[PDB]
């Protein structure tokens, strides 16, 4: 079916030192599979998923060399940015890059991505056509003119339409897979005659999920308390949603869990003894 | 397989 690959790069300038702080994290279907980190004793790309451990030495040496190239590209770019913004002083000048591709069931490029941020805001992005750029401000317009003159978009398009798609195929074959949520309801004291019912969804992947509380198929008037979706640390996610209900009425309430890995949404409740 | 940026800097 549909699949994706992304690389999330962060570079923080340290112009008084040899190179910027640089980290690249790669994802396949939003799951981390590789990473390069300059904060490491011996910086190199490493597998972050067991199915990558069968790639071969040439792959790792090749990826590492590209990262050393990116480190220099980020270092010179950050010096240019320092000048575009009139040497405005700061200890954390940040350039971020996200790139990658979406593959369809029919193996075509659905969408190619390339976008940059400087100082936490959009800077320049390659448009969906993989031919034109959207510039966020005056400084980004300088970059846009430079890249239009040098034909930069063609290099990125060729990567997104080619190498990105080819390697995403290779990875999917190597890695041979959604994890459905397992839910349960916990019961907690709250006030005199009232109780908190907390619906937990655990062990799910992807992170996208919806939790709702209902009474006899109808929505509740109260607003649910919820927590933002959070990683468990094993590649799976957690979330909960709670309601305050009268003591002795708990069994009547139902939690529904909506997730792509579920043939149909879950329905569960707290069962009294 | 990672993208190596086009030689033209920002």
């Amino acid at each position: 079916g549909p699949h994706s690959m992304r690389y999330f790069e962060t570079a923080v300038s340290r112009p008084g030192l040899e190179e910027p702080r640089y980290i690249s994290v790669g994802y396949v279907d939003n799951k981390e599979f590789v990473r390069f980190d300059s904060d490491a004793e011996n910086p190199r790309y490493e597998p972050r998923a067991p199915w990558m451990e069968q790639e071969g030495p040439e792959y790792w040496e090749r990826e590492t060399q590209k990262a050393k190239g990116q480190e220099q590209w980020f270092r010179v770019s950050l010096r240019n940015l320092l000048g575009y913004y009139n040497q405005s002083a700061g200890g954390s000048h940040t350039l971020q890059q996200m790139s990658g591709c979406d593959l369809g069931s029919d193996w075509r490029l659905l969408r190619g991505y390339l976008q940059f941020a400087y100082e936490g805001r959009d800077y320049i992005a390659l448009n969906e056509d993989l031919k034109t750029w959207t510039a966020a401000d005056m400084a980004a317009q300088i970059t846009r003119r430079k890249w239009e003159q040098s034909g930069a978009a063609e290099h990125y398009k060729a990567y997104l339409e080619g190498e990105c798609v080819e390697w995403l195929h290779r990875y999917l074959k190597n890695g041979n897979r959604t994890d459905s949520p397992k839910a349960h309801v916990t019961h907690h004291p709250r006030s005199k005659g009232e109780v908190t019912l907390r619906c937990w969804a655990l062990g799910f992947y992807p992170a996208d999920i919806t939790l709702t509380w209902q009474l006899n198929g109808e929505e509740l008037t109260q607003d649910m308390e919820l927590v933002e979706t959070r990683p468990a640390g094993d590649g799976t996610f957690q979330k909960w949603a709670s309601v305050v209900v009268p003591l002795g009425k708990e069994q009547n309430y139902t939690c529904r869990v909506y997730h792509e890995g579920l043939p149909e949404p879950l329905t569960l409740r707290w069962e009294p003894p | 397989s990672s993208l190596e940026n086009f030689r033209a800097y920002v």
Partner: T-cell receptor
Amino acid sequence: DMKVTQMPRYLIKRMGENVLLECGQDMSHETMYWYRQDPGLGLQLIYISYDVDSNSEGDIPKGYRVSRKKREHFSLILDSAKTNQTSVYFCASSFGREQYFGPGTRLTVLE
Amino acid sequence: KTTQPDSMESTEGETVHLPCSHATISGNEYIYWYRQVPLQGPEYVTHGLQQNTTNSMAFLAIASDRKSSTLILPHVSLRDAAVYHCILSGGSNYKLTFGKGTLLTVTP
């Protein structure tokens, strides 16, 4: 507009004297290069400069050193001229598209 | 690396075809063409990544498999006589390796 300068066009130096070859580009391109070319042979890279104080040895760096303190200039230094350094030296710059070359300096080192 | 014929001879006003072979090219390598008149600074002619590119100086034709290319100079002038270098240039790389090139002679 796209112009790389080199002066002089020709230079005679005695063996063992120091030499300073200069190159300039007012377009403030980040990348600059020093090449040499012996007759009948091809251009060979001596050094590349990715930016101010970011210099890397090319294919034939021995007997040369470089200076890049500003992006507009790139210097090639021969601390002690050898007769076999008699050649034509070309400087170049780039912004990421093609390389723009200077007109060259013909250096003749004599005993 | 690229491979080109050592020489090409032509009379002014005719079309010149300069072939280049690069069977081990990678997906990210451009095909650049530079020319150099003896003892003068080399000069960029054209470049392309895929298929065809036209500019004021020349036409570049790249084969569909990208394993060969041709620089085409319609109606050559005496000013076009030079050594023509076909070089692979990594899209992420500033370095070039100049090879032998093709010495193009154009007779009046």
